[PDB]
């Protein structure tokens, strides 16, 4: 028996089916969501045989203001600083949250304010380069991490272990002031 | 200031406060028709008419695709871990690599090993190591398929034999030797 074996962007063949493959199949998968319509059609040989993972998505964003400066589980946790933003979402595929992740500049701010800095203790996260920022979105705790030092806004999910490479979190505005670590 | 519907594919569909300089709302519909594929994307956003040519024009990259395939005949043996094209296809494993300039690109497919036709050449096959994996008890003759019509040997400071495309044979160097007539990569011919 010979069937059309054709994927989109795969090998499209006239195929001699294997012994025990007594059927030709054509399948049409259609998908409708907001601002997307997709139709795939595959053909192949098949046989009547009688007889769950997790998804992880991550956004990382860096902003800058100078000229041409951009050149070169079931839970979510993010950290968003004032220069860089990192969010990580993880779901069980049976019941998954496909809601999008918004970049830093689109998150509404939450009212929290935290100090922000990056780099080594003495330079980069001195209290000369450390400045207060408004937190945005779900990152409503103030975070310090050291292992080098980073400060910013964080979600509670990112504060709960706090282990090496250690993190400290606190729930009140300004609480990550540099000589309070 | 201006506010537009901002909607992406699989993304954040918002009502957006546009930037001061953004005087336009954009709606964009991209449609794609290929053999056995139809796609429609709709993205809405804020935009601005930027006048003449934007500074220091544009760029054009390279697209590179690689297929790697392993077969086995044993029971649940695929459990897990446990500007041109060149391929090598062995008897167990197949690796092909295609490279194109996006302006003139060959979107032709890469076919798995079992669907490529035999080309008539036959070469020896083994991988891994002299004592184990490329003994001449573990070295077998195989029919080559598709564009892989050369017999290849390679070794490094590990050894593999198989069928190879001329693209994979045109220089040595971790050393490679190729030959064009059947059986010529026999271990007693190195
Ligand atoms: C996902 O959730 C279902 C119940 O909702 C459970 O039976 C299944 O084992 C879960 N899978 C994973 C990978 O957590
Ligand atoms: C691609 O090829 C065209 C001519 O075929 C050439 O003008 C162009 O510069 C090439 N681009 C790259 C990135 O190689
Ligand atoms: C070949 O067998 C294993 C690798 O599969 C390795 O331990 C062994 O040392 C190799 N033989 C020689 C002579 O290196």
The answer to whether residues B102 and B60 touch, using CB atoms and an 8 Å cutoff, is yes
Mutate to test the interface with B, among A35, A98, A109, A136 (most CBs of B within 10 A): A35
Q: Whose CA is nearest to atom 4 of ligand 1?
A: A94
CB contact under 8 A, B115 and A41: no
> What technique was this entry resolved by?
X-ray
Token code pair at residue B167? 């693209």
The answer to whether residues A125 and A96 touch, using CB atoms and an 8 Å cutoff, is no
Token code pair at residue B57? 């024009």
| A105 in B contact zone (CB under 8 Å) | no
Three-state secondary structure of chain B = CCEEEEECCCCCCEEEECCCCCCEEEEEEEEEEECCEEEEEEEEEEECCCCCCCCCCCCCCEEEEEEEEECCCCCCCCCCCCCCCEEECCCCEEEEEEEEECCECCCCCCCCHHHCCEEEEEEEEEECCCCCCCCCCCCEEEEEECCCCEEEEEECCCEEEEEECHHHHCCCCCEEEEECCCCCCCHHHC
Mutate to test the interface with A, among B36, B55, B98, B111 (most CBs of A within 10 A): B36
Q: How far does the centroid of ligand 2 lie from the alpha carbon of residue B171, in Å?
A: 25
Q: Whose CA is nearest to atom 7 of ligand 1?
A: A94
Q: Whose CA is nearest to atom 3 of ligand 2?
A: B103
Measured CA to CA in angstroms, residue B104 lies from A179, B86, B97 at distances of: 59, 18, 17
Three-state secondary structure of chain A = CEEEEECCCCCCEEEECCCCCCEEEEEEEEEEECCEEEEEEEEEEECCCCCCCEEEEEEEEECCCCCCCCCCCCEEEEECCCCEEEEEEEEECCECCCCCCCCHHHCCEEEEEEEEEEEECCCECCCCCCEEEEEECCCCEEEEEECCEEEEEECHHHHCCCCCCEEEEECCCCCCCHHHC
- CA angle at B167 for the pair B174 and B88, rounded to the nearest 5°: 70
Torsional sign, CA A153, A158, A162, A166? negative
CB contact under 8 A, B12 and A42: no
Contacts of B3 in chain A (CB under 8 A): none
At a CB cut-off of 8 Å and minimum separation 6, what does B65 contact? Answer: B97, B98, B99, B110
Residue found under tokens 């954040």: B12
CB contact under 8 A, B38 and A39: yes
The answer to whether residues B42 and B29 touch, using CB atoms and an 8 Å cutoff, is yes
Phi, psi of A158 (to 5 degrees): -85, 0
| B14 in A contact zone (CB under 8 Å) | yes
Contacts of A38 in chain B (CB under 8 A): 38-40
Buried/exposed B70-101: b ≥16 CB within 10 Å, e otherwise: eeeeeeeeeeeeeeebbbbbbbbbbbbbbbbe
Residue found under tokens 């028996």: A1
Q: How far apart are CA A78 and CA A102, in angstroms?
A: 12
Nearest CA in chain B to A100: B11
Rg (CA), chain A: 25
Token code pair at residue B86? 């060149």
Torsional sign, CA B17, B21, B25, B29? negative
How would you classify the pairing of strands A141-146 and A149-154?
A: antiparallel
Q: How far apart are CA A103 and CA A87, in angstroms?
A: 9
Closest CA to A41 of B187, B143, B35, B49: B35
Token code pair at residue A64? 């800058």
| B72 in A contact zone (CB under 8 Å) | no
Pocket lined around ligand 2, Cβ cut-off 6 Å: B 60, 101, 103-104
The strand pairing partners of A31, in sequence order, are A38
For residue B43, give how far its alpha carbon lies from the nearest alpha carbon of chain A (Å): 6
Q: Whose CA is nearest to atom 13 of ligand 3?
A: B131
At a CB cut-off of 8 Å and minimum separation 6, what does A154 contact? Answer: A77, A78, A79, A80, A139, A141, A142, A143, A169
Q: Whose CA is nearest to atom 5 of ligand 2?
A: B104
How far separated are the first and last CA of chain B, in Å rounded?
Answer: 76
Q: How far does the centroid of ligand 3 lie from the alpha carbon of residue B78, in Å?
A: 24
At a CB cut-off of 8 Å and minimum separation 6, what does B82 contact? Answer: none
Q: How far apart are CA A154 and CA B46, in angstroms?
A: 29
Residue found under tokens 């010979």: A2
Q: How far apart are CA A56 and CA A46, in angstroms?
A: 33
Q: How far apart are CA A37 and CA A31, in angstroms?
A: 6
| B114 in A contact zone (CB under 8 Å) | no
């Amino acid at each position: 028996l010979r069937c059309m074996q054709c994927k989109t962007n795969g090998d499209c063949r006239v195929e001699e089916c294997a012994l025990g493959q007594d059927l030709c199949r054509t399948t049409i998968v259609r998908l409708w969501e907001e601002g997307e319509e997709l139709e795939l059609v595959e053909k192949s040989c098949t046989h009547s045989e009688k007889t769950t993972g997790l998804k992880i998505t991550s956004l990382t964003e860096v902003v800058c203001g100078l000229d041409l400066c951009n050149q070169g589980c079931p839970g979510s946790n993010g950290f968003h600083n004032n220069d860089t933003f990192h969010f990580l979402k993880c779901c069980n595929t049976t019941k998954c949250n496909e809601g999008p992740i918004l970049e830093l500049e689109n998150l509404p701010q939450n009212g929290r304010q935290c100090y922000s800095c990056k780099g080594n203790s003495t330079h980069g996260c001195s209290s000369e380069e450390t400045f207060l920022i408004d937190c945005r979105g779900p990152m409503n705790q103030c975070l310090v991490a050291t292992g080098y030092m980073v400060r910013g806004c964080a979600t509670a999910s990112m504060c709960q272990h706090a282990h090496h490479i250690d993190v400290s979190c606190c729930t009140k505005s300004g609480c990550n002031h540099p000589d309070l670590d």
